[PDB]
Amino acid sequence: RQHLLSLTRRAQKHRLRELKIQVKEFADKEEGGDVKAVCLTLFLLALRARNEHRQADELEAIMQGRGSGLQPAVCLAIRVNTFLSCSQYHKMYRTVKAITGRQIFQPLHALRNAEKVLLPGYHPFEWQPPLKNVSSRTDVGIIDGLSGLASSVDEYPVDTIAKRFRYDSALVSALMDMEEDILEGMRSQDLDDYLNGPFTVVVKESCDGMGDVSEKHGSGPAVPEKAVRFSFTVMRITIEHGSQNVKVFEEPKPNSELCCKPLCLMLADE
Amino acid sequence: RRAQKHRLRELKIQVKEFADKEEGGDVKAVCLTLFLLALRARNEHRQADELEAIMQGRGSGLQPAVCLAIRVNTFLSCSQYHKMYRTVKAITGRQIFQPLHALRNAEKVLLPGYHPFEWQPPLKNVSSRTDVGIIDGLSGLASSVDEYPVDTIAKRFRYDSALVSALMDMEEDILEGMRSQDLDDYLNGPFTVVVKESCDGMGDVSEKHGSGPAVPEKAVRFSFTVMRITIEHGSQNVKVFEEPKPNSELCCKPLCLMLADESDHETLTAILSPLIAEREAMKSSELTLEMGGIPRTFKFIFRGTGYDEKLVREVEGLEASGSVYICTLCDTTRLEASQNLVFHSITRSHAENLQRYEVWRSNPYHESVEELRDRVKGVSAKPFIETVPSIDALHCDIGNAAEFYKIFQLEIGEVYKHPNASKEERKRWQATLDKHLRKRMNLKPIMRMNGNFARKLMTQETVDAVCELIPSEERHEALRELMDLYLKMKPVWRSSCPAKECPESLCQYSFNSQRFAELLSTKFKYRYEGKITNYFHKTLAHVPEIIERDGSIGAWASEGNQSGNKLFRRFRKMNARQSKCYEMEDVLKHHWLYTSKYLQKFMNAHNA
Ligand SMILES: [Ca+2]
Ligand SMILES: [Ca+2]
Ligand SMILES: [Ca+2]
Ligand SMILES: [Zn+2]
Incomplete structure (x- = not known):
């Protein structure tokens, strides 16, 4: 009844109960069941009456997901390319949060969710004609690399742990x-962005066995341990537009450490 | 824009008339809280709180101390921190993190050799400069082809600067402590500080850079810990400060660190002679230091306690640990320790050690070696550091737990009935106990007995399990009672303040240890007839007096240093320059930072 900076959440609630009544009724009858946009524009106008387009634009930005927010893909990029771990990222998260007051970084589960979108096994796709001897599922993630290899005391002994992606889903x-x-290259070559022609991809796959990936996690020089990575890279995407082929995409630096996507990891002598 | 103006002018006139009449025309805060609560309704507390901030107005970015705290308590490199910095700056558009040079400037303040101070009287043989930070630990040790070849890289702070x-x-x-104790902020009483000293020779701090597992290299880190601060208000000493977690990973301030075996006694003494000179100089002086305006007079008490038995015996001038003179507190023989289990006193100081070494080297009474060594109770070396008579706690409980493990292996085999077996039934007994315990408690056995193994093994349940492996009828109770008493005893020393954590155990400890001694002496004489291990002498006979002399036993221990070893390795590979000269002062600087406190109360801001 007196002021509002000191009036608590429910004290203000009882202060403007009737404000809330009128605004909610008018909103959900005029905008067809909505209150977010109307209260948004209401506050924008009632603060812009004092010509504060700085704060107006800042608030429209936070409503547009751009500014002091770090959308989860961005924080995931930082945690990956910075080699942070989850406990350390959580330390940094909570510290920046408690000091600033804002929430600049995003929590861990908002990174797991934004990660699920970037691994294989998320999008719906379909082949034609269907792939012989290949499954039809579309949520196939990290398969065991042995591929159901017979592992008992009766078959040829095998202990090489190996993980992989399914080639098609990856x-x-x-x-x-x-x-x-x-899409950007498509526009750049002056092509109709709404196109679905037979895009000819050109991939370059390559395996290369590395040596001595073992360590010293303890008091002992454990063993020579070798690994083998099979990997590939989307070298060049072309389309058969008109009567010719045009490079919709060409890899900028083909033989770079961060354009060679891993496909299979095994621990075995090459 | 004009569109929404038209669309909403009705609500506009409605809300404006109603809010102008209701609160007096303060539509600003009214509509503010309106949209706040409306957006919170759909669980948008993120956007709601950031909008609360944007309207409040505050702290879009961080200040250099916080960024420094983050990259130190997160172990980021400089390339990685810079990468994160520029990413956030380009995405947000603001500048939340601070550039690297800002963090170097905010770092120059928290390292030693930045503030002014004044010793009065001055420190004998110590310089008077105040800006001496990281300096070569060799202290100008002559290194030519003609001198005793030294090759140990070693960095240190000057002790007073630290x-x-x-x-x-x-x-x-x-300052907060004086506030809480109802004193004056502007009080400059002679603050007596009580510092703990701890030196521990961590080993195998190397890594394979290329091919070849050849060389193992060791290290030594001498460090201290401000343990309490106490002003003498009027005619009483009030505890302005006490360390919450005394033997903790991150309050053991590093002071000196070197790459050299802990038992390379010449090198060790070459490196630690200057430090001992400095800590002996600053025992008859008073640090004048302006602290929050007004200047204060500090006055120190050093206590050297973070020493495992090995270094205690090495740097006090005592025979190696497997001698006949077992306790480093009382001068008694192992045989006499087993005859008389708990009646000993504490009678081995440092001045006494120096004087006995003088007796040895001089040999004033002209007697052969085997009665001279009785005269000097096993002191045949010049004492080097002044440590205090105390027992470690980590190694104490580990040793006692290993001894119970040995007793278990013996009871399984019923060594009492048929003694003197061979060195195959021994391993059989061992594998029996191992398989049995791994089956019953998922307690997978290991060789280097760590603290988790000792923690799990020393439980009434473990004896209740292993009790199902002895054909006897009474060894059951003769282990049950034994474990009962050992557990009634463990908190007394393991506690960081047994006076106000378990004073009943503390007032019963004498009776419990005496009964424990009787029980070893009667139902276990087949083992403790001669040899009794050192820790079953310390634990039994000296704890109820180390308590009355120092308070606790758990606080004055080496755990704080033993943990820091982790950090070292990490730093040495993640934050260093491989230069073999800079590559060590980097580790030492970063460890000093990590151990700081003006940063731990930033990385603990989420709690408060
Ligand atoms: Ca190759
Ligand atoms: Ca040690
Ligand atoms: Ca150690
Ligand atoms: Zn003793």
């Missing part, structure tokens, strides 16, 4: 990881 |  993920660049 | 930086690091905390 290739689909690698393509929808660069959808944006595909 | 203490000055620690004190003006915990300035805010001890």
